[PDB]
Amino acid sequence: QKQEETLSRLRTIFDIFLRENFSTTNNVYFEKLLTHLQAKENAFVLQAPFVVEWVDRCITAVTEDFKKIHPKVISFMLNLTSFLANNEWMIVRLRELDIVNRAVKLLQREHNLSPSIKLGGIRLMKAITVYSMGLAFLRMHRIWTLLIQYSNNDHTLYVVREARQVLYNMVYKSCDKLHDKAVTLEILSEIMQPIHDNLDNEMLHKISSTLDLLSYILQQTLVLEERTTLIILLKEHHDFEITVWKLIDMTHNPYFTEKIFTTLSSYNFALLLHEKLLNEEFTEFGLAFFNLMKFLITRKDGLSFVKLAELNHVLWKKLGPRAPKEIVIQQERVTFENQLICFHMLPLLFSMKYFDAYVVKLLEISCEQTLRLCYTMRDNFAGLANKCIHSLLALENVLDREQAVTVCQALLYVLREAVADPQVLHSVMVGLRTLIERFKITWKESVETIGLVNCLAFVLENTSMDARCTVQALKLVQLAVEHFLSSALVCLGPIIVKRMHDTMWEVRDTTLELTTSIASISRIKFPAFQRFLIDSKIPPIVYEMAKNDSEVYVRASAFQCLSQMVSINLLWENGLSQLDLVDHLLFVMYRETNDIVRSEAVITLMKIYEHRKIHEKYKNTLFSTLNYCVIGDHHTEVKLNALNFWRREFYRQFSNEKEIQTSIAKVFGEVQQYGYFGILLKCLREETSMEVLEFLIKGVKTMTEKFERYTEADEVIESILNSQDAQLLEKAFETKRHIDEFYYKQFAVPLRQFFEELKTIDLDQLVKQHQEWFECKENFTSLLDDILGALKRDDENMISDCY
């Protein structure tokens, strides 16, 4: 069986690794192996008695000295040990041998490990620390000071986000398993030490790092669903708030104070969850939170305020179901969720306003403790608006139903005031668009949608800003049309026509998107009041700019618009049928490369043929071009659309004793004379793609139950080589349509041959081949063969280059 073969290949390559001389770039291979050792299917290659022997040999080869014994194999070794450390049998074999102890000592006694050995060792620590015996060893070895060293000093930032998880896991598991508080107190004191010791610019780094680590520990306890005693230990022995409030006293920085305020707020929320869970009102959190926010008011800092409000919101949403949503602060019924968003929105409203006109309507949502803080904010009084908007729209992942409505209304107000720097404008328009399309803020929820459309019309019309904002404006108008449905017409009349003539690509494509949206609205969903808006001048300009605008995406968008607005009767009867449209489609479907637009031309043709009539003189050319549109080197979309055309045509024509037998035989005769069975054979036996195969298989299968019943040359070389390509092109600069109407005659295969030639050929093998080969393309054995070839061959002149 192949298992011994792949194990032998792995044995050979592992034997290659240990050799003292090594020079191999192209790191990919290593990571590939690691991923292919993670999959559970290869679970036998770790069970074999070879890998642990390799690990032992490499470690006893690295522990005495590795000045140069392994450049990068060590990282693979540690990751492989971590992959081994899962408990079936490896844990006791690793325990009985001196592997894990030597690895930890190796990590301890080194000085300048490159940041891939470190992550491997930390991965080993994480994989071993989930088990009880691993925790016993870690408690024995006094390992945590190394983890503090990593999470405090190193520059990797992929290590610290991995080291802190192991650190917090030891702290939580030691606390919650009823183990001695001596070790937990020692860990916490070791974390706490750079602050207690201090109670320039060098100690501040240690202070900030340990504050951030403490905040991470507290937030991870906040995620927890069970009662833990870590917070009481943190409050009692190393009294936290008093030390932190003494720490804020001397040192001064705006960036550094965000960390102290987030650790204080995270501590408050963690204390709530781990004191209220077991020993009413929430006043104890209340006074602390509000004097904290008052201190942020008094310090006169803007960005830290909105960031802290954001994080308070995130944490409260992180509490989850165990939150009453109504806090009894002091004899009151104060719902907490609204005051966070009031604090969040207020800097934006106060910044863009400049004496209150609209915030006064908002503040009745807030309660008196928020009113006093707002009234001292106003007395307390840069680019702060866009930061607040981006914070608000960072919150949108977790924001349930009504705060979305409130923030949408506030953004509507700030947009209305901004209309009557463009960065705030672009930010608010993007945010309003994404909130509307996510939270379904249809006209019943918003109040002043007329102001929205009017200010958007002014923006689109009278000032002509840069094109990065006009696109967003047209997207907003599109959302307003298709969601705020229940003035607009005279505003959207000339601006569409003017923007369809814009100098830039980015505006014309978006305007075509808006036009096809409002044309799709003009169907049965909405009355014809939109149609006469379109019926002024739009279908001529759409057609004659779909003809030639010299940008491929523009022509694609125009063709799909013209497909959408051709199946409505008023436009076709008034101003579209006069233009010979099918002629231009036939010209496009054949004599036009860049086949992103050919597929949508096929769609437009499908709509025209299905919902209208074409002249009887075009049918031969039509079917010839349609047969050509699938046979030949075309992209997948064109072939799939053309097969959709043929299936729709076949089924549509099919709905029109002996008499039924003769009529049905005539129907198959009419469809085969133009050629449909033979083209299916030639597309089935030859065309190689993924989804076309399933489409053809399901089509033929659905069909086949309703079917079976019925010297001299060197002077030119040196002359070429001694002139630039700018001088071989000055010389180069200075010096049919509508295919013949009987192209389909060759693809005219009768029904009788379609019996036999479909009976002989296999069906599921065609769809099976191209998927099974892709599954076997990157199997483990192929990777081992490739990496053996890479190791044995050493071509120095083959350089990894800019792809």
Binding site: V28, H155, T156, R161, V716, R793, Y803
Partner: protein, 424 residues
């Protein structure tokens, strides 16, 4: 003030080029590129480094893309549509109109990110012209300088309040045929990121023409897999001029869905460096492959990924006289790497092995900067620190000693995911 750079890719490596110039209190993202090796989520740069679990990014002030190679552009739709991003994306006009074609071709080869994502990702793009100081919101001033190495490549000069950075990306300081040499004024930045692909490093051009001519005469066909743009237009002047100065009669087919791009490239070329049809070039179809006489077929893609080039290669393989002049690096996993690596057998759709007997060749055409070019660039710019990100580890280690020896500067070589704090 402390400049921090933390390459999420392309540090002691190539591909996934992505650098985070967090400096002056304003986050900036350099090139956003893909890695055509890995097929898992490692293909695009890891973005959990900035905002974990957050599908919207509100930290980077601006994203700067140097040139259109798919190790500097391929992740841009993923960075702008899957992970949200709505801020500006500054890039040059030829790169702006060349990138969608390459991204669409990569989409077709890889089948995930739809054409709608391609369009929406580049409605955000802002184009920048050379030597024109354009400002993001306030005290984030960007200038672009002519670089080389591909059509429409520039290297950028970023200033945030008396702290300048010059990011080169890709450049070429030697004079050449296609594009000349990059130029820089006497700005004195507090950093200069650079390239070190050719730290250790005519004859690469004569051996192309003189070999393809001597191979086409013997009745053997020639296959040249290329991408849509880039290197496919480096050669289609040499072959056409070689077969117009010397009268030849063999056809050189050109892979039909490619020919209109050869007009756009040379339309932009004469604008950048300082209708169009070819004489002996005619596009071809799947029927011409089995025809008996000699040909020189260009095809897409350029690493024998999948598509036209693989089906052509699957039929011309057993013949001895045929040849496959791959013109660029072939990454791990493409049939190109096995063939350039001495494989004489390659597997296929149903346990079929094509016994390659064709004469595979390899000729690099990229024209990066060699060893002398980087010290020439340093002598023109005179920075305060030097940083090398693009290339292999040992070559940068060797170049660091020479830089320290000559100019007495420092030199940093970060790994993937390692902040490099630089002081003043």
């Amino acid at each position: 003030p402390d400049i921090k750079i933390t390459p999420l890719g392309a540090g002691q490596d190539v591909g996934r080029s992505c650098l985070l110039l967090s400096m002056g209190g304003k986050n900036i993202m350099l090139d956003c590129g893909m890695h055509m090796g890995y097929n898992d989520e490692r293909r695009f740069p890891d973005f959990s480094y900035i905002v974990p679990e957050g599908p919207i990014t509100s930290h980077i002030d601006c994203v700067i893309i140097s040139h259109f190679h798919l190790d500097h552009c391929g992740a841009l739709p993923y960075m702008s549509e899957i992970v949200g991003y709505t801020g500006p994306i500054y890039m040059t006009h030829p790169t702006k109109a060349i990138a969608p074609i390459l991204l669409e071709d990569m989409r077709k080869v890889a089948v995930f990110f739809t054409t709608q994502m391609i369009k929406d990702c580049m409605k955000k793009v802002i184009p920048v012209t050379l030597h024109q100081s354009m400002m993001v919101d306030t005290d984030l001033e960007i200038k672009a300088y002519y670089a080389g190495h591909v059509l429409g490549a520039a290297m950028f000069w970023i200033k945030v309040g008396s702290q300048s950075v010059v990011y080169t990306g890709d450049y070429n300081m030697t004079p050449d045929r296609h594009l000349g040499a990059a130029w820089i004024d006497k700005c004195r930045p507090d950093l200069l990121i650079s390239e070190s692909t050719y730290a250790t490093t005519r004859c690469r051009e004569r051996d192309f023409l003189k070999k393809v001519h001597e191979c086409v005469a013997k009745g053997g066909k020639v296959l040249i897999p290329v991408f849509a743009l880039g290197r496919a237009q480096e050669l289609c002047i040499l072959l056409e001029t070689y077969w117009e100065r010397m009268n030849l009669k063999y056809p050189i087919y050109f892979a039909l869905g490619l020919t209109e791009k050869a007009n756009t490239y040379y339309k932009m070329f004469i604008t950048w460096t300082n209708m169009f049809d070819f004489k002996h070039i005619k596009p071809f179809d799947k029927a011409y492959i089995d025809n008996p006489g000699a040909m020189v077929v260009f095809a897409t893609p350029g690493m024998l990924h999948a598509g036209l080039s693989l089906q052509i290669f699957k039929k011309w393989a057993p013949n001895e006289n045929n040849m496959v002049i791959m013109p660029g690096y072939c990454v791990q996993g493409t049939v190109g790497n096995k063939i350039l690596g001495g494989a004489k057998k390659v597997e296929f759709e149903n346990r079929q092995v094509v016994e390659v007997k064709m004469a595979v060749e390899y000729m690099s055409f990229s024209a990066h900067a060699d060893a002398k070019g980087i010290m020439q660039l340093i002598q023109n710019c005179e920075p305060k620190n030097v940083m090398l990100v693009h290339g292999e580890a040992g070559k940068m280690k060797f170049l660091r000693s020479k830089i320290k020896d000559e100019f007495n500067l420092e030199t940093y070589m970060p790994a993937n995911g390692e902040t490099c704090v630089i002081s003043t």
